[PDB]
């Protein structure tokens, strides 16, 4: 099993798309850290729900947007563990209208987390996976990042900001051999359609299996900087 | 001239690219708002180059990451000459360090003013523009928004979500016939070493005028009027798609 005892941290973990992935890291070894922002509730299921299955997973409060909540998160996982493998920058949110009426407040927040969660965390990661001399990391992007979307100003710019951080993460940390990518979800299931070729949504068990093989498998030691697309076609490439 | 009686607005022209912009565009027959956030000697000079060369401009101080700012950036435009026909988004800052070592701060106001200022001009000149049923508006970008570069994960990060940004509002402006587009620029000789020629296939940093006549031709070109969500690199062939 690729990741025993690789250790991995999933942001906004609770529900959807971050569980499956936390869901799927445990399935491959691995010991999994389950951030999220709000109510536990939902964390804890799948805390619960990894060891049902024989693994190994610890919840975390993180608002991963502030500073120091990500600081809180990063002794955590080093305090029970001392080690992490690979760090799935993953949480996120929307607040969607059309540009005229986009509160200030509606862009900032959706920036701060979306993205300046994802620099935070990164920048946390970096220095653990530096002095390991290894490591991974896998942030989801969106489709909408690459195509832009009407009503998404705030959600389109930071998903594509979130694909050129995660290109220079790459060039910086790649002489240690840690990679650093991006999945780009489409439609998830967790009126458009005649749109996607494939014809349907997508499954948060199928974006998780990509993470996945980024995360663990030999044949992507060598791939970095890089975006791959789980759209069913929407976009190409 | 394509531009007569035109009005454009740039972000950050006192200096380098910024400035080229300025005197392109009033070469083009546009009036120009010079923007800037600092010294107005540097924002004199280019609007005095403009009135040698028998154009029009004035200096705007505002500093585009504040929201009422921009308000009064864009009152003003308004206020002087009453309709707004071109925006260019140049404003820019470099904080420039590993991420091991970037401050949350410098983070912050490298993505505020980068990204956050593409943001709120865009958000002001939309509602001008749609009432105009016209207008086309360019952002400043950057190849290292595409291609990443080690020491601006700050910096990269904010030209990319630029170009993510351009393409929702060209979505967004496109049926009033308003085009939103980016230039990237590669390693220009002004800006605003050694061996980065060697990665150049044309063997020279790009002038700061030539990054000026791109979007000049975006503003002005009545063929420009069909291209919209696009971003254009003028890098001497330093990123090919």
Do not use: H
């Not at 693994?55 to 975390?60: L, P």
């Not at 942030?139 to 195509?147: F, Q, T």
């Not at 840690?178 to 998830?188: C, K, L, Y």
């Amino acid at each position: 099993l690729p990741l025993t005892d690789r250790i991995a941290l999933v942001t906004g973990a609770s529900r959807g798309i971050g569980r499956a992935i936390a869901l799927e890291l445990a399935a491959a070894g691995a010991k999994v850290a389950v951030n999220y922002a709000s109510s536990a509730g939902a964390a804890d299921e799948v805390v619960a729900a990894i060891a049902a299955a024989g693994g190994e997973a610890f919840a975390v409060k993180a608002d991963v947007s502030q500073e120091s909540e990500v600081e809180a998160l990063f002794a955590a996982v080093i305090e029970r563990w001392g080690r992490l493998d690979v760090l799935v920058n993953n949480a996120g949110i929307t607040r969607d209208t059309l540009l005229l009426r986009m509160k200030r407040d509606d862009w900032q927040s959706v920036l701060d987390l979306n993205l300046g969660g994802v620099f935070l965390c990164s920048r946390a990661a970096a220095k653990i996976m530096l002095k390991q001399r290894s490591g991974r990391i896998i942030n989801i992007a969106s489709v909408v990042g690459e195509m832009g979307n009407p009503g998404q100003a705030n959600y389109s710019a930071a998903k594509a900001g979130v694909i050129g951080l995660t290109k220079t993460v790459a060039k910086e940390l790649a002489s240690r051999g840690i990679t650093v990518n991006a999945v780009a979800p489409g439609f998830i299931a967790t009126k458009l359609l005649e749109v996607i070729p494939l014809g349907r949504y997508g499954e948060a068990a199928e974006v998780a299996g990509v993470v996945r093989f980024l995360a663990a498998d030999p044949a992507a030691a060598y791939i970095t900087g890089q975006v791959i697309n789980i759209d069913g076609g929407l976009v190409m490439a």
